[PDB]
RNA sequence: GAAGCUGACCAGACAGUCGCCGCUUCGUCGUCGUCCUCUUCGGGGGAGACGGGCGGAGGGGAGGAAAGUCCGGGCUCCAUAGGGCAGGGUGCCAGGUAACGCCUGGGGGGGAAACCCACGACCAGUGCAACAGAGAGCAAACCGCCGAUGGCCCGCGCAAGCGGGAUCAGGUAAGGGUGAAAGGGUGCGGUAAGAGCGCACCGCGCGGCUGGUAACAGUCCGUGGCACGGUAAACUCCACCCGGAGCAAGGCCAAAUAGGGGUUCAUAAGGUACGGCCCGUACUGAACCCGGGUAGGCUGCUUGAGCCAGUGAGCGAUUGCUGGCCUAGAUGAAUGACUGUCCACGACAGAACCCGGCUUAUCGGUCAGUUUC
RNA sequence: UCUGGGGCUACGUAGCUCAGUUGGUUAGAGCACAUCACUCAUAAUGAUGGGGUCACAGGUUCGAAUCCCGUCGUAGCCACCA
């Protein structure tokens, strides 16, 4: 079961505001993750790519698609922790292989 | 035998992955002032239907540009009888829904080494360092200006005739030159060191002849050596607007603040649409808070003048007609990697109201048209 | 350290604040750091250090900036019931 329903995506800015009021910061100077412990069990994801933070509008959409595919491909493996991914300016230089391996190393250490 | 640029033109992919989205059939939860079968009222046998509502079966969802209302049009509450007309737009003529800044060519040049029209009245007022007042008025001519119409001085017995003295409205300044791009031509008695003072020749306004739906094209006839050939949203003209802001603008379910409050009222400066300009026509008010609530939704253009072949007409873009095609749009926001045959390597960007254009980042494939030998 | 359809503007006049219907003008002032009677060392009643291509080739008389359909970024706000 590796589906991707609409209910598994954020649809209200209120939840965004709540998680941004008290975010948990842990990541790298190039890519980082914010989020908090969830109570409903089913993991959730969210995407915030600022035009100022990330220029080259041909990106983001590609980045959104790639990160959504990685999330749905590794939905069950990751714990109930909510996750939101934010990429800094220096991301486009790394290719897809580098991005995939960096995300793999990142998510292979969150062992609690 | 080898090379530019536009007219247009191409951005498919699959045997497995993993699977984001409207529709029809079978049922799954609650019903219908068309109700037959019954109505004994648990609803069974329905002709037509809904909801972020699940299980199957099918067709589909990225550029020559959607960023950029940059220009014009398609569609809502609230006004709308100018002989007012301030102010922004065709400025060569004709052309399709109401539409403009797309396209055709003659008179004017670089009608091939430039595809460019943005070619409308110019002393109908008195203005910007080049401090040479020539690009608005000026001239102690610049090794020619007494080498003579008007005065003086140096050489004179009928008071004849030469050189200079940069003195004056002394032919002058473009026939010569010094920073401004030489703002016409040798010439006939221009001879007075010569200022167009009468001059065949190219060119201006005015009118006839060949064409013109239209700007004009040939000194064929005249008058003038002529008198400004040169800087336009730099006073001005309209046959089409004068309607603001735009699609997040009307419509809804058993939820309760029309809530102290402000510049004073029987004509006058509170929000006169239409004039930061005078009216025609008249809401029981007048720069704000002290948020009472809100993400549960949908038609509005989603069968929209977009497309193909065949007709009297063209230097040029056309559809009166014949089949159709039309199976791409939920508002955190629609596309991933691999075992492969042409190989033109995936450069840069985005699909949620629509169309006609923009020398654009556009490497790659040439049908029409170039000079070279 | 918050937002993809959409808008009237302020800017490359040094990166901000004042803005010129080309007043032929290497020209102004208030932030990083500086010299003079040693402010009992929290800057301007005085002289100045002035990489102010005043965005890219653009008026074929000499020109940047009022005359750009060819590009970037920040700040003044918007769905109803009366
Ligand atoms: Ca294509
Ligand atoms: Ca458009
Ligand atoms: Ca309204
Ligand atoms: Ca298609
Ligand atoms: Ca649409
Ligand atoms: Ca819609
Ligand atoms: Ca086209």
Residue numbers in the entry: 2 to 113
Give sentences from the paper.
Ribonuclease P (RNase P) is an endonuclease whose primary role is to remove diverse 5′ leader sequences from precursor tRNAs (ptRNAs). Bacterial RNase P consists of a ~400 nucleotide P RNA and a single protein (rnpA, ~120 amino acids). RNase P recognizes the shape of the stacked acceptor and T-stems which span the two domains that together form a molecular ruler. In bacterial RNase P the 3′ RCCA of ptRNA pairs with a loop or internal bulge in the C-domain (L15), while a conserved adenosine in the catalytic core contacts an optimal U(−1) flanking the cleavage site 5′ to N(1).
The ptRNA_AU substrate has the optimal consensus leader while ptRNA_GG contains the slowest dinucleotide sequence at N(−1)N(−2). In contrast approximately half of the bound ptRNA_GG dissociated rapidly while the remainder was still bound. In both ptRNA_AU and ptRNA_GG bound complexes, the 5′ leader is positioned with the correct phosphodiester bond placed in the active site, while the 3′ RCCA is trapped in the L15 internal bulge loop of RNase P. In contrast, a larger nucleobase at the N(−1) position of ptRNA leader sequence, as in the case of ptRNA_GG-bound complex, sits in the cavity between J5/15 and J18/2 of RNase P thereby forcing the A248 nucleobase to tilt away from the leader sequence and stack with C73 of ptRNA.
